[PDB]
Amino acid sequence: IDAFRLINANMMVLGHEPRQTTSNLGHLNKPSIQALIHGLNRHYYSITINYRKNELEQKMLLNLHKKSWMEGLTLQDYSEHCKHNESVVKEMLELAKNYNKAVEEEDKMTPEQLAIKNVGKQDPKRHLEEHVDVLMTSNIVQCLAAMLDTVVFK
Amino acid sequence: DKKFHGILDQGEGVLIIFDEPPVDKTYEAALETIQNMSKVVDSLYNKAKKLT
Amino acid sequence: EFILEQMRLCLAVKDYIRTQIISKKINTKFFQEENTEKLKLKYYNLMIQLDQHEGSYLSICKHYRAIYDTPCIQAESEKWQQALKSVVLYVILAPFDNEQSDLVHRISGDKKLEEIPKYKDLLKLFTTMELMRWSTLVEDYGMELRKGSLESPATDVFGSTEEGEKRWKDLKNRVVEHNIRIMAKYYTRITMKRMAQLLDLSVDESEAFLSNLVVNKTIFAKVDRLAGIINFQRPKDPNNLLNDWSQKLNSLMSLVNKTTHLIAKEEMIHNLQ
Amino acid sequence: AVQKVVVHPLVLLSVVDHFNRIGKVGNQKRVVGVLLGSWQKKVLDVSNSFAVPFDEDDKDDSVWFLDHDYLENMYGMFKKVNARERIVGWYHTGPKLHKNDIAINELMKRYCPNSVLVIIDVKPKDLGLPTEAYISVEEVHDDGTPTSKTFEHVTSEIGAEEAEEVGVEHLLRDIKDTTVGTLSQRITNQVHGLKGLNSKLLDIRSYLEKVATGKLPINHQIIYQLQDVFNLLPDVSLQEFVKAFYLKTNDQMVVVYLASLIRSVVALHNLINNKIANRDAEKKEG
Amino acid sequence: TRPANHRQLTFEEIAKSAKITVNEVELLVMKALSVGLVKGSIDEVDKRVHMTWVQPRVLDLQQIKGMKDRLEFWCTDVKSMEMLVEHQAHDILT
């Protein structure tokens, strides 16, 4: 929101440096090179800003943006939770075979070479610990949410 | 020959007929991962045990 | 008009295999009826003989409504009374279908079809609950298909005795079958004597009736022949117990969601100001 | 006919700033304004609004005023600056459903066919969403009369927009409970949603305030639904509800055991990757 | 009248309280399901029916005391189970 305002080209012809800095508040942000290509400091000047906040709006946006209504008190497709759980584990097996593949070129050429070299084909490591987290948070939430309703509902 | 399955009674010839595949896809697919990872830990000797 | 002739010559030979071809030339050749009140109807009178015979009790649907369509027939009411006869004797004869189950609403809602007092009740039979077997049915409607001015396609039922046999049978599915439908709907488990008493025939013939529908798998049932304990719609369901339980959870939370905003306005129409 | 509504933070603040600029009246003023927006695919949208001048006296509380010149000129300007934007309904500041809002909607139904209202909050506190929208419905019944134009709350939510998320999320910079692991579910619905069921539990308890002391309508249409609630109490822990539960928990904890099994091996392999970084650095550097 | 403990009645009881014979009560209850005032299932061999959903009726100021009491401990069920969540799940998110 870099707001500006004109500086006098008359005073530019005078060669007189304007705006008489009396406070360490102006030269804090650094200007963009594209504005330096444009007028910037030959025709106008920069202005620092801030934002006026209160308490009253901050809460009524914070509590009013993304509030799930009763969603976690559901069961999430009770046939297909475990079926999707299969649908990750099945290729997680062969990705674990890649984890039985990628360990076996250690004690080899200088693992920065193992950093430049793994740029064409996927690693089992990061891809593995992805799916472990996905199955974990996929299962535990449905597990507990399945069990609150047995107490709360009779 | 397992093309049909059930039972055959000998006293009076009764064929209780029943069928369901309970769970097949799950425990074996989670199982062969374990025997992959055991081989991985066997490979971890050859970068860990001999090394340091 | 020339090309619609020779299909009667093929039907003089009883050539279905050519009759459907040369009629398939002209099934796309519609929209000439607008100056021929009868010649379009002559195309249809050869379409029964292709369709009445073998099994095509659903191909005579658009036939019979199509010969109800023609606006000349409406002013020859008694020859149009047998068009009311034609518009009922094939919607029922037709085997069970979604096309039947809305076709009954196509023919239903008619101001002038219920002028026959019998056949509004005849369509009332198949929509509603259990049908009076057959013998108590033919006591009420086996004679009205002989008496009256509407008697002539009911003589197409009766008179030709083999078409007769097909329609005594062309009802034999329907009712003998209708009961089986709501038995599968409402009966969890029944013996192999109560059902056969509700069919008024043998337990052996009852097993022949329950065989060809489950090898058709249009009714799923697991019968018994030692204690006769037969049942309907019995899987094991490791899933739908807790699944439909969760459905009751969702409907429950929606239900308590319903009353909550309903109460507040009711307080506001008494205790606002 | 209307499925649900979509409310923006721009209109949401755009009631509040007007409430501040009338905030010097002090005594009593509802902030009635014209709600603008569209609806597509039977999904109601609200994007812009303004506020009509409005005064109302307590004695003979049926005397309301909308400056339709202020309606037509400013809506003509808003159509001119945006022909895509149009009317969608109205709103009022809505503490507790004021009485003239039975015929405000009838006063300006000639603009929008589903002239919707929106009740907002100016003192923001709840354990839910302080955003409301009814709909005008009239249904003669067998326990009243003809004119039965009551209001029915269509469900509501705060919709987002790619334009406004950038500036809004800039306008927070304060606190943001991201890093969704399990904690976001555990707190936004396993902590919060149970207390959501607390208030809906408590509301019929507030209605139950009529046993011998409350208002005059006794039952009629309140008890079929509650009768369906206590009819709709779920199955007890005896029949087969136990067996499939131990079945599927007995399947879920398998997969949990697999993931927890592999995770330690991952961290072990990383510890090997760290001791190679230790032992071939202490001698090399010195 | 029958509680959610069972709400499962028999054709002997129907033949007792309606004094109508054994070979008519099935047509009666199938007619009731066809109308749809009641929703349930029919077993023939054990002569019982699992009636589930009933047509809702009206009631006086006395049954709201019973619905009040069934509301009452249902409140503290939600309180009691939720207190485990607030107490145990406290250290996850302050």
Q: What is the DSSP string of C203-259?
A: HHHHHHHHHTTTTTTSS-EE--SSS--EEES----SSHHHHHHHHHHHHHHHHHHHH
D17 shares its domain with D147: yes
Q: Would you give the distance in Å from CA D136 to the centre of its chain?
A: 19
D262 shares its domain with D150: no
Closest-CA residue to D156 (of D188, D131, D121, D124): D131
Q: Would you give the distance in Å from CA A127 to the centre of its chain?
A: 19
Q: How many distinct structural domains can be found in chain D?
A: 2
E28 at the D interface (CB within 8 A)?
no
- Residue in D254, D262, D275 nearest the CB of B52: D275
| Six-digit token string for D240 | 């087969």
Residues of C whose CB is below 8 A from D101:
none
Euclidean distance between the first and final Cα of chain E, in Å?
48
D131 shares its domain with D271: no
Alpha-carbon distances, residue A90 vs A16, A97, A139, D204, E11 (angstroms): 76, 12, 16, 49, 53
Q: Which residue range is the domain that position D109 belongs to?
A: 2-182
D112 shares its domain with D252: no
Listed residues D182, D205, D233: the one ending a domain = D182
Q: Do A140 and D258 touch (CB under 8 A)?
A: no
For residue A47, report the phi and psi dihedrals to the nearest 5 degrees.
-135, 130
D178 shares its domain with D252: no
Q: Do E77 and A148 touch (CB under 8 A)?
A: no
The answer to whether residue D200 sits within a structural domain is no
D175 shares its domain with D228: no
D78 shares its domain with D169: yes
DSSP-derived letter for residue D89 is E
Query: Which of helix, strand or coil describes residue A30?
Result: coil
Residues of C whose CB is below 8 A from D229:
252, 255-256
The answer to whether residue D189 sits within a structural domain is no
Q: Do D276 and B52 touch (CB under 8 A)?
A: yes
D129 at the A interface (CB within 8 A)?
yes
Question: Is-contact C38 C1, C-beta < 8 A?
Answer: no
Q: In Å, how far is E91's CA from the nearest CA of chain A?
A: 17
Q: Do B26 and A93 touch (CB under 8 A)?
A: no
| Six-digit token string for C48 | 């029964």
Q: Do D227 and E61 touch (CB under 8 A)?
A: no
Residues of C whose CB is below 8 A from D153:
261
**For A78-85, which contacts have Cβ atoms below 8 Å and span 24 or more sequence positions?**
A78/C239, A78/C242, A78/C243, A78/C246, A79/C239, A79/C243, A81/A138, A81/A142, A82/B26, A82/D248, A82/D251, A82/D252, A84/A138, A85/A135, A85/A138, A85/A139, A85/D252, A85/D255
Query: Which of helix, strand or coil describes residue D240?
Result: coil
Question: Is-contact D240 B13, C-beta < 8 A?
Answer: no
D36 shares its domain with D122: yes
Q: How was this structure determined?
A: cryo-EM
β partners of residue E51 = E40
Q: In Å, how far is C152's CA from the nearest CA of chain A?
A: 57
- Residue in D61, D203, D217 nearest the CB of C260: D203
| Six-digit token string for A106 | 């250690």
Q: Which residue of E has its CA nearest to C229?
A: E45
Query: Which of helix, strand or coil describes residue A45?
Result: strand
Listed residues D182, D211, D234: the one ending a domain = D182
Listed residues D149, D182, D215: the one ending a domain = D182
Q: Which residue of E has its CA nearest to A152?
A: E78
For residue D245, give the H/E element and its range: helix D243-285
D165 shares its domain with D248: no
Closest-CA residue to A100 (of B28, D271, B37): B37
| Six-digit token string for B39 | 């081989």
Q: In Å, how far is E49's CA from the nearest CA of chain C?
A: 9
D76 at the A interface (CB within 8 A)?
no
The answer to whether residue D24 sits within a structural domain is yes
Q: In Å, how far is C191's CA from the nearest CA of chain E?
A: 6
Closest-CA residue to D36 (of D18, D66, D15, D16): D15
Question: Is-contact A38 A45, C-beta < 8 A?
Answer: no
